[PDB]
Design a binder for this molecule. Structure first.
Ligand SMILES: *[C@@H]1O[C@H](CO)[C@@H](O)[C@H](O)[C@H]1NC(C)=O
Lengths: 336, 210
């Protein structure tokens, strides 16, 4: 089975550069996949960070693109993420993921081919572009075709890339206005021609400030295939703070059933482990999520016991802070 | 392209048939995926291409839609189905997620158990004074907390904390802390913690003097 493992720090100093790596198992990174990163703040939803394509091409969420760098190392079967000038706002659980061109199996003998463009579909004047036609294994000829002038180009330079797929590449060294248009793929296999692929628009952008354009402006697709995240890593929690290691201050909380508690104030960093009577009391406990009290953490933990057991028997809260290597016990004594 | 999921929260019980909506700001054909996220866990792909079930997902999960409106239907709910659900557009860059819909367990209404605690003698003999209040095991989620010092409302120095739906009794809990100096705390007598919740017209008041 396919596994993705995140690696990196837990803590990152404010205005620093966060560095994460994803180790891929049961697959090859050098395949038709989009190796991606997603992040989730402590109480928020999911935010798409960016992705890296087989061609080495990168796409990043505009919200934060300037601070983003996604790379891939085929030799080590891994991909990485670097984040510059990190602030408290960059606090989250970071996930590495695999995006795949999933297909509901409709055809098996001659499946409908796919058309892609590298580096993209919006090419500057005079620059190059390559179309990649994808089909099943055993194709003898691939054909690229133009809509407006209905010109075509055939190739027998076919190469197997996976146990199920095969491909051909068509390069235009220097694009002009008359090269822009709609392009498709069709292949010949076993005395038969396939169904033609979907069209893919190629635009050649002008060399001036005034140049401007079913996706948004310039947000033209680069493939007829839709990529979907089908595998997620379990995630790595990253905390961005200029704070120092600080052990907690443990304060007791005294008032048929009775609720007692403990206040765990001013520590850095999360987590803390709170137990009651060394785990013997567990059925009625509530430990609350920590809040940020001026760059230090604070939490409370409540315990509910019968009135017959307290103050007649001792109730103690056990507070452990692994980071500072501290382990404290606090007895709950009554008030008048 | 903005994705708008509705409702933000839905309450149901096991065995029930439910439906979640996802709306796109522009036509996106059938290029929509559904993800499932259980508390404490990593996401999981359920549905791709609006209507296609990913390999190994139960037939209870059904996805439907084209263009701008997309629906997720779970018929005959099981305990493991109470989770957060996100929809995602995958046609245009950036392929942005919806804000999520949390599916929670609809249990019987339950009032909060309110407890107030004065500063500890150890915290005080160090210059600090935190007044802690607990609002435990209440249903539904919607609750309002208020602090009163000598009959006067107080908002400054108040820090609140909410637990997720309890995995055992399906209730919710909340902790509110009013923090001040030993000097400031020693100038007043009456400290109140007031809880307003669906289960009562009159708020629950818990006080201490000195
Ligand atoms: C990921 O989380 C699941 C929890 O269901 C666990 O089974 C798995 O071992 C974890 N670790 C890895 C490396 O996937």
């Amino acid at each position: 089975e396919v596994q993705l493992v995140e690696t990196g720090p837990g803590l990152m100093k404010t205005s620093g550069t966060l560095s994460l790596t994803c180790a891929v198992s049961g697959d090859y990174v050098n395949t038709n996949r989009r190796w991606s990163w997603v992040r989730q703040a402590p109480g928020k939803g999911l935010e798409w960070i960016g992705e890296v394509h087989q061609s080495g091409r990168t796409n990043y969420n505009p919200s934060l693109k300037s601070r983003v760098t996604i790379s891939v190392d085929k030799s080590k079967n891994q991909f990485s993420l670097k984040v510059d000038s990190v602030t408290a706002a960059d606090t989250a659980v970071y996930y590495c993921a695999r995006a795949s061109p999933l297909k509901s199996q409709r055809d098996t003998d001659l499946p409908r081919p796919s058309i892609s463009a590298e580096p993209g579909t919006v090419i500057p004047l005079g620059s190059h572009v390559t179309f990649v036609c994808r089909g099943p294994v055993g194709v003898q000829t691939f054909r690229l075709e133009r809509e407006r002038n209905y010109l075509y180009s055939d190739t027998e330079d076919v190469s197997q890339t996976s146990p199920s797929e095969s491909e051909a590449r068509f390069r235009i060294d220097s694009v002009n206005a008359g090269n822009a248009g709609l392009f498709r793929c069709i292949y010949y296999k076993s005395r038969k021609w396939s169904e033609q692929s979907d069209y893919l628009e190629l635009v050649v952008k002008g060399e001036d400030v005034t140049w401007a354009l079913a996706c948004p402006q310039g947000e033209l697709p680069i493939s007829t295939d839709i990529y979907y995240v089908d595998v997620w890593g379990n995630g790595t929690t990253v905390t961005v703070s200029s704070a120092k290691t600080t052990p907690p201050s443990v304060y007791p909380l005294a008032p048929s059933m009775v609720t007692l508690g403990c206040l765990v104030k001013g520590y850095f960093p999360e987590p803390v482990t709170v137990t009651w009577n060394s785990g013997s009391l567990s059925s009625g406990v509530h430990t609350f999520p920590a809040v940020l009290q001026s760059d230090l953490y604070t939490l409370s933990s409540s315990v509910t016991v019968p009135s017959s057991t307290w103050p007649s028997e001792t109730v103690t809260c056990n507070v452990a802070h692994p980071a500072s290597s501290t382990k404290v016990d606090k007895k709950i004594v009554p008030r008048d | 392209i903005r994705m708008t999921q509705s409702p933000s929260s839905l309450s149901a019980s096991p065995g029930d048939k439910v439906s979640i909506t996802c709306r796109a700001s522009q036509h996106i054909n059938d290029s929509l995926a559904w993800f499932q996220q259980r508390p404490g866990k990593a996401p999981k792909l359920l549905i791709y291409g609006a209507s296609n079930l990913h390999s190994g997902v139960p037939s209870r999960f059904s996805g439907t839609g084209s263009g701008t409106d997309f629906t997720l239907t779970i018929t005959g709910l099981q305990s493991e189905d109470f989770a957060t659900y996100f929809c995602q557009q995958c046609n245009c860059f950036p392929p942005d997620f919806g804000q999520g819909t949390r599916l929670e367990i609809k249990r019987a209404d339950a009032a909060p158990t309110v407890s107030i605690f004065p500063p500890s003698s150890e915290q005080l003999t160090s210059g600090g004074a935190s007044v802690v209040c607990f609002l435990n095991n209440f249903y539904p989620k919607d609750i309002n907390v208020k602090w009163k010092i000598d009959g006067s409302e107080r908002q400054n120095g108040v820090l609140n904390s909410w637990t997720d739906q309890d995995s055992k009794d399906s209730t919710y809990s909340m902790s509110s802390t009013l923090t001040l100096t030993k000097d400031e705390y020693e100038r007043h007598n009456s400290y109140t913690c007031e809880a307003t919740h669906k289960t009562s017209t009159s708020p629950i008041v818990k006080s201490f003097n000195r």
